[PDB]
């Protein structure tokens, strides 16, 4: 196998997602090659094919499909800083006044990914407001704001370096969206 299946399933598990309905996106690393992204169900055979061909690996975090209109709920808010010392990125949520992430993800690239997982799926309007407030308070990359946003998948390589994305600092904690709305301005 060209990927770590345990990390893939752990990513889905921590997001309380169902592999049968999870959407995979394979994106070519070099913009100038103008290679079409794959949009397909997440399966081991498809990830195997995309990784060995040279694609980077992503999943749609929200549930329902590939476009914003197809998303009916999202199980987590999440974000990343565009840059900054990596070690600083791991802990910088604390100085922002954010609660501790449910888990974090090392991508192999320039950013740590932070996730806060809710106990129940969140409808798109409520989720959209929480995600926007999270971006504002932390100063995250403002690109990652739409309900069909894809995020780097754990257990697959960052193709530029070969480093395999890894989940770390999982706590098991689940947040409540109403409580989160109070702590996020
Ligand atoms: Ca809790």
By CB atoms closer than 10 A (0-12, 13-18, 19+), residue 52 is: exposed
Q: How far is the CA of 121 from the centre of ligand 1 (A)?
A: 14
Q: How far is the CA of 6 from the centre of ligand 1 (A)?
A: 25
By CB atoms closer than 10 A (0-12, 13-18, 19+), residue 65 is: middle
Q: In which region does residue 176 sit, left (phi positive, over 0), alpha (psi from -120 to 50) or beta (all else)?
A: beta
When the candidates are 3.30.70.1790, 3.40.50.300, 3.40.1210.10, 3.30.930.10, the CATH number that belongs to 5-183 is 3.30.70.1790
Neighbouring residues of 30: CB distance < 8 A, sequence distance ≥ 6: none
In Å, how far from its chain's centre is CA 159? 17
Exposure b/e, 103-113, CB count within 10 A at least 16 = b: bbbbbbbebbb
Q: How far is the CA of 126 from the centre of ligand 1 (A)?
A: 18
Q: How far is the CA of 11 from the centre of ligand 1 (A)?
A: 19
Percentages helix, strand, coil for the chain (3-state, rounded to 5) are: 30, 25, 45
Q: How far is the CA of 119 from the centre of ligand 1 (A)?
A: 7
Q: How far is the CA of 146 from the centre of ligand 1 (A)?
A: 25
Q: How far is the CA of 80 from the centre of ligand 1 (A)?
A: 22
Token code pair at residue 2: 């060209």
Scanning the chain, the segments in alpha helix (DSSP H) are 5-14, 44-53, 86-91, 124-138, 177-183
Q: What is the resolution of this structure in A?
A: 1.5
Q: DSSP of 36-78, one letter per residue?
A: PPEEEE--HHHHHHHHHHT-EEEEESSBS-SSGGG--BEEEEE
For residues 140 and 80, the answer to whether their CB atoms sit within 8 Å is yes
Q: Parallel, antiparallel, or unpaired for β 112-122 and 103-106?
A: antiparallel
Sole residue written with tokens 């995600």: 131
59 beta partners: 24, 151
Token code pair at residue 155: 């257990």
For residues 45 and 3, the answer to whether their CB atoms sit within 8 Å is no
Token code pair at residue 159: 């193709």
Q: How far is the CA of 48 from the centre of ligand 1 (A)?
A: 36
152 beta partners: 58
Q: How far is the CA of 69 from the centre of ligand 1 (A)?
A: 29
Q: How far is the CA of 91 from the centre of ligand 1 (A)?
A: 20
By CB atoms closer than 10 A (0-12, 13-18, 19+), residue 88 is: exposed
Domain boundaries, the chain: 5-183
Token code pair at residue 171: 């706590």
By CB atoms closer than 10 A (0-12, 13-18, 19+), residue 117 is: buried
Q: How far is the CA of 95 from the centre of ligand 1 (A)?
A: 21
Q: How far is the CA of 156 from the centre of ligand 1 (A)?
A: 29
C-alpha neighbours within 13 Å on the C-beta side of residue 42: 27
């Amino acid at each position: 196998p060209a990927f770590d299946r345990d990390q893939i399933l752990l990513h889905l598990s921590l997001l309380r997602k169902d592999i049968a309905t999870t959407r995979y996106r394979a994106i070519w690393p070099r913009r100038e090659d103008k290679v079409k992204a794959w949009t397909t169900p997440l399966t081991g055979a498809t990830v195997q094919d995309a990784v060995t061909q040279g694609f980077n690996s992503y999943i749609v975090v929200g549930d329902g499909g590939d476009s914003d209109a197809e998303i009916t709920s999202v199980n987590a808010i999440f974000g990343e800083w565009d840059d900054g010392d990596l070690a600083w990125q791991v802990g910088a949520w604390e100085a922002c006044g954010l609660p501790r992430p449910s888990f974090q993800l090392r991508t192999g690239g320039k950013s740590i990914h932070h996730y806060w997982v809710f106990h129940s799926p969140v409808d798109v309007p409520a989720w959209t407001e929480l995600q926007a407030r999270l971006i504002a308070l932390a100063g995250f990359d403002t690109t990652n704001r739409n309900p069909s946003r894809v995020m780097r998948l754990a257990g697959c390589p960052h193709q530029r370096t070969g480093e395999v994305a890894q989940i770390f600092n999982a706590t098991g904690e689940l947040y409540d969206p109403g409580q989160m709305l109070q702590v996020l301005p």
